[PDB]
Design an enzyme around this catalytic site. Structure first.
Site, mmCIF file in Angstrom:
data_model
loop_
_atom_site.group_PDB
_atom_site.id
_atom_site.type_symbol
_atom_site.label_atom_id
_atom_site.label_comp_id
_atom_site.label_asym_id
_atom_site.label_seq_id
_atom_site.Cartn_x
_atom_site.Cartn_y
_atom_site.Cartn_z
ATOM 1 N N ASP A 2 0.310 6.382 -5.782
ATOM 2 C CA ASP A 2 0.303 5.409 -7.488
ATOM 3 C C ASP A 2 -0.575 4.601 -7.829
ATOM 4 O O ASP A 2 -1.445 3.280 -7.304
ATOM 5 C CB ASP A 2 1.446 4.607 -7.291
ATOM 6 C CG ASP A 2 2.457 5.768 -6.857
ATOM 7 O OD1 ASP A 2 2.365 6.859 -6.421
ATOM 8 O OD2 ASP A 2 3.858 5.626 -6.900
ATOM 9 N N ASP A 30 3.893 6.362 0.891
ATOM 10 C CA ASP A 30 3.160 5.975 -0.445
ATOM 11 C C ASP A 30 1.750 5.015 -0.386
ATOM 12 O O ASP A 30 1.596 4.290 0.521
ATOM 13 C CB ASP A 30 3.414 6.722 -1.816
ATOM 14 C CG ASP A 30 4.090 5.292 -1.811
ATOM 15 O OD1 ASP A 30 5.165 5.533 -2.999
ATOM 16 O OD2 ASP A 30 4.076 4.525 -0.822
ATOM 17 N N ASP A 80 -0.481 2.939 -2.729
ATOM 18 C CA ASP A 80 -0.370 2.093 -4.186
ATOM 19 C C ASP A 80 -1.114 0.990 -4.319
ATOM 20 O O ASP A 80 -1.376 0.365 -3.730
ATOM 21 C CB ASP A 80 1.161 1.511 -4.273
ATOM 22 C CG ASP A 80 2.215 3.030 -3.651
ATOM 23 O OD1 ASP A 80 3.082 1.777 -2.449
ATOM 24 O OD2 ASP A 80 2.359 3.311 -3.526
HETATM 25 N N1 DZ4 Z 1 13.460 -0.938 -7.380
HETATM 26 C C1 DZ4 Z 1 12.638 -1.679 -7.863
HETATM 27 N N2 DZ4 Z 1 12.778 -2.902 -8.263
HETATM 28 C C2 DZ4 Z 1 11.668 -3.915 -8.097
HETATM 29 N N3 DZ4 Z 1 10.498 -3.738 -8.255
HETATM 30 C C3 DZ4 Z 1 10.190 -2.360 -6.807
HETATM 31 C C4 DZ4 Z 1 11.169 -1.493 -7.115
HETATM 32 N N4 DZ4 Z 1 10.940 -0.414 -6.554
HETATM 33 C C5 DZ4 Z 1 9.551 -0.713 -6.232
HETATM 34 N N5 DZ4 Z 1 9.123 -1.756 -6.726
HETATM 35 C C6 DZ4 Z 1 7.898 -2.811 -6.567
HETATM 36 C C7 DZ4 Z 1 7.901 -3.393 -5.027
HETATM 37 C C8 DZ4 Z 1 7.372 -2.284 -3.797
HETATM 38 O O1 DZ4 Z 1 6.653 -3.012 -2.711
HETATM 39 C C9 DZ4 Z 1 6.708 -1.560 -5.271
HETATM 40 C C10 DZ4 Z 1 6.483 0.431 -5.068
HETATM 41 O O2 DZ4 Z 1 6.843 0.076 -3.258
HETATM 42 P P1 DZ4 Z 1 6.986 1.998 -2.917
HETATM 43 O O3 DZ4 Z 1 5.534 2.834 -2.711
HETATM 44 O O4 DZ4 Z 1 8.228 2.427 -3.659
HETATM 45 N N6 DZ4 Z 1 8.123 1.590 -1.131
HETATM 46 P P2 DZ4 Z 1 6.450 0.824 -0.119
HETATM 47 O O5 DZ4 Z 1 5.452 1.485 -0.191
HETATM 48 O O6 DZ4 Z 1 6.272 -0.735 -0.579
HETATM 49 O O7 DZ4 Z 1 6.905 1.134 0.977
HETATM 50 P P3 DZ4 Z 1 6.888 2.811 1.507
HETATM 51 O O8 DZ4 Z 1 5.582 2.876 2.927
HETATM 52 O O9 DZ4 Z 1 8.381 2.550 3.251
HETATM 53 O O10 DZ4 Z 1 7.580 4.097 0.864
HETATM 54 O O11 DZ4 Z 1 7.050 -1.457 -6.019
HETATM 55 MG MG MG Z 2 4.153 3.190 -3.047
#
Ligand code: DZ4
Ligand code: MG
Lengths: 51, 428
Positions: free
Chosen positions: B352, B293, B295
């Site tokens: 998001d 995604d 963000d």
């Molecule tokens: N369960 C949790 N607890 C605490 N903080 C969190 C969390 N989940 C997300 N965050 C915070 C930290 C995360 O960096 C942010 C949302 O990140 P994502 O879009 O959900 N996953 P990303 O985009 O980083 O990687 P990929 O491309 O592989 O899907 O919100």
């Molecule tokens: Mg994201």
DNA sequence: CTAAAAACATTCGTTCACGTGAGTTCCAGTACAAGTCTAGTC
DNA sequence: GACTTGTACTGGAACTCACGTGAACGAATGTTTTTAG
């Protein structure tokens, strides 16, 4: 009260009864002296070496 | 001295005065040369009933007081001297006579690319299986072990390198040993080939489908994706939207799509409210080239104007005709499914948006930029060690009811007594 | 040649040093039970 | 699963008591040998 030893009286090789030995009369002695360093009154120890 | 090439010096500490005197007298009678006081002339020194290490301590305290360039004497035991006296000559000298990897992931930098790809992948697979089984603690510990392996400066080739690594017990050590010794690990393959793991992984990728729903479907006899489409009456809006655009959302996103989406969102926010600032957070801020995604974080440097920014921008974009899904169709958070037109046609990629004032901006950036595991570890460290509560809004002290706001993200780390790490070094 | 003195032999009570067995009590180690694992929004 | 905190058990060590071995010291008493008159 304390038992000097727990022994086994043997009437026969097959008959054995456990008994305890006590000293109802024991001689009294002064508490053993302990060596002390003169300068500081700190306890010392004695070690025996044979060479 | 009969032997001009021999100079023996004894030691008082352990032998004692009487023993030293007797040994010196015997050696003198046997023609040996015994030095009353330590000096450079001494060639050998004899201890007695002393550990080797302790003897070294004696040597060093004597080296500092000696001129440089003097050859240090040779340490020896009383056995050598006794044998020499008994045999009448100096016997030959033989062998007998002669802060780190902190547990918390917030203290150790973790580069994106590491030298333990296979082990980290295996541990991640085990963690995913444990999470599917419903044990959160097992998932957490496996993730911590994988993160620890990810931060190793050098590749691991022998088990002896796992001693000092925290969060490495019997299970993880055995898994790594199996991986190293034989290559492919039996347990990893057994769990992976299991149909339950594969079906759970297939179901979880569906937007709006979690572990609980996936397990419920699995126990209900639903095993294939098509079977889900056969009963489109037990699926909410999220599940239906995810299932419809499954192929589009299954493809990892590239950086060009990120740039296009950022330009579109920047135009939308600029037209909605002038002076709006948008920052790209998430995985793409840590240096990742692929993602799931995109963000963003929207803020206004001036204080107290982003009261209702998000609804206006969202409705404007919907009027433009790009939002397939809106979380709600005053809120400061939303997840959507944008309609990106490819240059050659369009593909669905999630986006998001989150809003936060300037005062809370650094905390929001820190919370939305770092990895999930890094955020968990940082929050745990703040709560336990320093006793402060850290969240996306601010840092709070239970003792003194006062916020710890700051003007930059560096100050947040500085307050907690932690070395600053760049976003690229916060990967797990 | 005889008497006095010095030396030697044996025994006895006491103190000291160590070693070894037995009985009683304390304690440092080991086993196991239970709690925790991030925070928020909708 | 790994760590942290708290509780319970328990086998061995420490301590005390008692006896036996070996040695020194004073102390005595007697007995034997050497030297002086
Ligand atoms: N369960 C949790 N607890 C605490 N903080 C969190 C969390 N989940 C997300 N965050 C915070 C930290 C995360 O960096 C942010 C949302 O990140 P994502 O879009 O959900 N996953 P990303 O985009 O980083 O990687 P990929 O491309 O592989 O899907 O919100
Ligand atoms: Mg994201």
């Amino acid at each position: 009260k304390r038992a000097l030893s727990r022994l086994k009286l043997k009437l026969n090789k097959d008959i054995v009864i456990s008994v305890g030995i006590y000293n109802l009369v024991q001689k009294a002695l002064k508490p053993p002296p302990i060596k002390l360093y003169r300068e500081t009154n700190e306890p010392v120890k004695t070690k025996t070496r044979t060479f | 001295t009969r032997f001009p090439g021999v100079a023996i010096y004894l030691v008082e500490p352990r032998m004692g005065r009487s023993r030293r005197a007797f040994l010196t007298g015997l050696a003198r009678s046997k023609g040996f040369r015994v030095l009353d006081a330590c000096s450079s002339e001494a060639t050998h020194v004899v201890m007695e009933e002393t550990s080797a290490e302790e003897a070294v301590s004696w040597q060093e305290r004597r080296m500092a007081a000696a001129p440089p360039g003097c050859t240090p004497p040779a340490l020896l035991d009383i056995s050598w001297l006794t044998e020499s006296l008994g045999a009448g000559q100096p016997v030959p000298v033989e062998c007998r006579h002669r802060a780190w990897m902190p547990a918390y992931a917030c203290q150790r930098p973790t580069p994106l690319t590491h030298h333990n790809t296979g082990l980290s992948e295996a541990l991640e697979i085990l963690a995913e299986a444990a999470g599917f089984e419903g044990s959160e603690g097992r998932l957490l510990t496996f993730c911590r072990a994988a993160s620890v392996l990810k931060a190793l400066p050098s590749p691991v080739t022998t088990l002896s390198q796992l001693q000092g690594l925290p969060h490495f017990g019997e299970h993880s050590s055995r898994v790594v040993q199996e991986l190293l010794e034989h290559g492919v690990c039996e347990e990893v393959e057994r769990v992976r080939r299991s149909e339950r793991y594969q079906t759970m992984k297939l179901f979880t990728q569906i937007f709006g489908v979690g572990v609980k729903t996936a397990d419920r479907w699995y126990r209900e006899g639903l095993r294939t994706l098509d079977d889900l489409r056969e009963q489109p009456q037990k699926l909410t809006q999220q599940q239906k939207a995810g299932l419809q655009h499954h192929q589009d959302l299954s493809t990892p996103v590239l950086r060009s799509d990120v740039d296009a989406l950022q330009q579109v969102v920047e135009e939308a926010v600029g037209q909605a409210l002038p002076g709006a600032t948008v920052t790209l957070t998430g995985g793409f801020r840590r240096g990742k080239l692929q993602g799931h995604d995109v963000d963003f974080l929207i803020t206004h440097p001036k204080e107290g104007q982003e009261a209702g920014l998000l609804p206006r921008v969202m409705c404007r974009l919907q009027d433009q005709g790009l939002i397939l899904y809106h979380q709600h169709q005053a809120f400061e958070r939303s997840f959507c499914i944008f309609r990106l037109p490819q240059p050659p046609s369009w593909k669905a990629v999630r986006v998001d948006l989150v809003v936060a004032p300037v005062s809370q901006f650094p905390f929001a950036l820190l919370g939305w930029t770092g990895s999930k595991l890094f955020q968990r570890e940082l929050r745990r460290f703040s709560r336990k060690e320093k006793g402060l509560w850290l969240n996306s809004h601010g840092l709070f002290d239970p003792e003194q009811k006062t916020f710890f706001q700051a003007a930059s993200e560096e100050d947040i780390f500085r307050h907690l007594g932690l070395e600053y790490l760049p976003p690229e070094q916060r990967n797990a």
